[PDB]
Amino acid sequence: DSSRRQYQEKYKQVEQYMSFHKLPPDTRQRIHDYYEHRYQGKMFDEESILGELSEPLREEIINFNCRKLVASMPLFANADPNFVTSMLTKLRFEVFQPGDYIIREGTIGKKMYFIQHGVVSVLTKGNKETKLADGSYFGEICLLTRGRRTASVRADTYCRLYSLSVDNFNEVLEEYPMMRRAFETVALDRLDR
Amino acid sequence: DSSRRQYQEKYKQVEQYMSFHKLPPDTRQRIHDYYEHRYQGKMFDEESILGELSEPLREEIINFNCRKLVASMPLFANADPNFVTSMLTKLRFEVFQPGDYIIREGTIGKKMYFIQHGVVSVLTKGNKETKLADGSYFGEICLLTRGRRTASVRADTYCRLYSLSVDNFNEVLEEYPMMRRAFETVALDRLDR
Amino acid sequence: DSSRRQYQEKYKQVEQYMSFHKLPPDTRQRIHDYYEHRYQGKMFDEESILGELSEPLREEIINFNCRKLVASMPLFANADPNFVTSMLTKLRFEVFQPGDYIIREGTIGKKMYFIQHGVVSVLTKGNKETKLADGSYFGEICLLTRGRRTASVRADTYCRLYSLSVDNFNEVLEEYPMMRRAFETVALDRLDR
């Protein structure tokens, strides 16, 4: 753990930031708890390690680290393993906090999200909200037809998510375009209900 | 206060540069004062801190940091908080010196500006000068017309500004179509006199 | 050698990485081995240095550095000195392990490959496997017709390769268009066989 050092070195930097801007005690509570959930004691340049290795090693390594997330992922557990690997290599780990608006209706959407751990409300205007939890995913609609978000999605609890940007989503469905209808169908169901 | 030391250390290399170049006394006094006024003893990797946090937190922090600018701005007076946040996250801090031309008539423009603090004169070939100060904005005409600057704008005092690029303007206005009218109105009234 | 130390220090970071993710013994051995072949005890910023020099110097160097690769290389010998220089400057060094799939049939190809040192099996579906080594190249067919990979290519031994992106490939034949044919020629004997 020299990555224990970094966490502290970098959190010291954030306390001087909060100081300098005199953020209210609540806000500092949030920043601090987030930072704890997100880095969980440690900071490292994961991407620059993987950057140093071959593509196959990256793929092996990523598959190991994510075999749990995958088995617990309806859409991956079931799919061609190569599609899975390619999706996995493009996933960015993200944390959100109770009450956070992950997607705001009307926005232009740049990411879509996968639920590793957490619960989330999907709020459309005029109707009862619905929920999504571990295993599900949202935000694919705007990725399919560039466009304004169709619903707001608010974290109901701490959420550990993996995002996928619009470019990477496109890159992947270019690689595995047989997999686009699978997202289209889901978009479609969601849009009529 | 490593921020304090970073500021003495960075101004040292600026002291280096000025020397290796024989910068006239006048110039080097403008640079030093600029430096003092813009960094004010403190030099830190703020964007690097902000980048370690979630979007929701960047929003909460920015909204707090800027609550006084927002308060001083007729444009945000009665508006959707999300529109406001959206605007804030795309503004960039700038500082100009007495005498500086922030905008020249007849030029291609891709930036507008929101005055946080200071006083600016608006010059038009053939007319009386007017002035603008805390809370106002300028350079929206060009962003609307996509043509050229219809007037020059010169700082009368040290100005603390927040610029906003045309791409950013249009994106925000895409998400918040109703706010396009606010800018047209102010532009037109400005042009009707 | 100061950049012996680099290798030695960065690898310790690779060590913390494998520990943190509890990677299988076989995976760790594989990484240890890859990192050993790829860097040979020595890590330093190449890009950063060639970056500091003029283009003509960069070219004087790459030509010298790679004369033995060029010698080994049939397509180069009878080609323009300038074509050879322009290709070298776009080549990226990449290492594969025994067993690694370099190219997988059916994938979208964005790269082709020249073999400094390696042996590689070429496996077309339901018919006789073939090999390629030092001097040879593969992955050309795809960059030629912007379609899918017509064979898989697996690495028999450690493979020291120089890759070349589609954009880059395109760039160069658009400059020396005489030279496209050479690839087309080697592509077509391969397709009909």
Place this chain on the structure above:
Amino acid sequence: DSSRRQYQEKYKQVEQYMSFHKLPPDTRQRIHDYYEHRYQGKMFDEESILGELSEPLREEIINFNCRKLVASMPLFANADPNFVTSMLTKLRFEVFQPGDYIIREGTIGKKMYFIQHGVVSVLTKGNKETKLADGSYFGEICLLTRGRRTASVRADTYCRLYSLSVDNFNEVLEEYPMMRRAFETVALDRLDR
């Protein structure tokens, strides 16, 4: 100045690179010498200093820094001074050596060059050499006709050049369409002689 430090540190790193790849004594001499001419014992990060100041300061600094260059150029003689500034802020300093081909005929050009100090020979397949020096420029033809290099341009002496990319070139001219014609004039003159 730790920029005398940087220089040594960065130059020590070139040496290790040179030893490592075992470059013939002549190649080493040219590297060594380029480096001395290009950096002249000092290494700092210009771009990041100017990067910490306002646009009007950059413009004042540059206009000073380049008054001889400007003085030296017929082009800039009776030019709208805001156009000179616009050109100036987009020039990148470059060094070349006796014998360097700055431009090879037939290549696809993406830059043009303004001679600060140096003599260059201009070679046309068939015709006789001519020479350009302090205060002249070359490379514009390709920029005006997004096409091939109509001539080679080799350096007779050490040259201190300022290059302008086609993007910046097309931007300055978008801003100043009048000026595209000063360039066409010379281009045509040079083509028809």
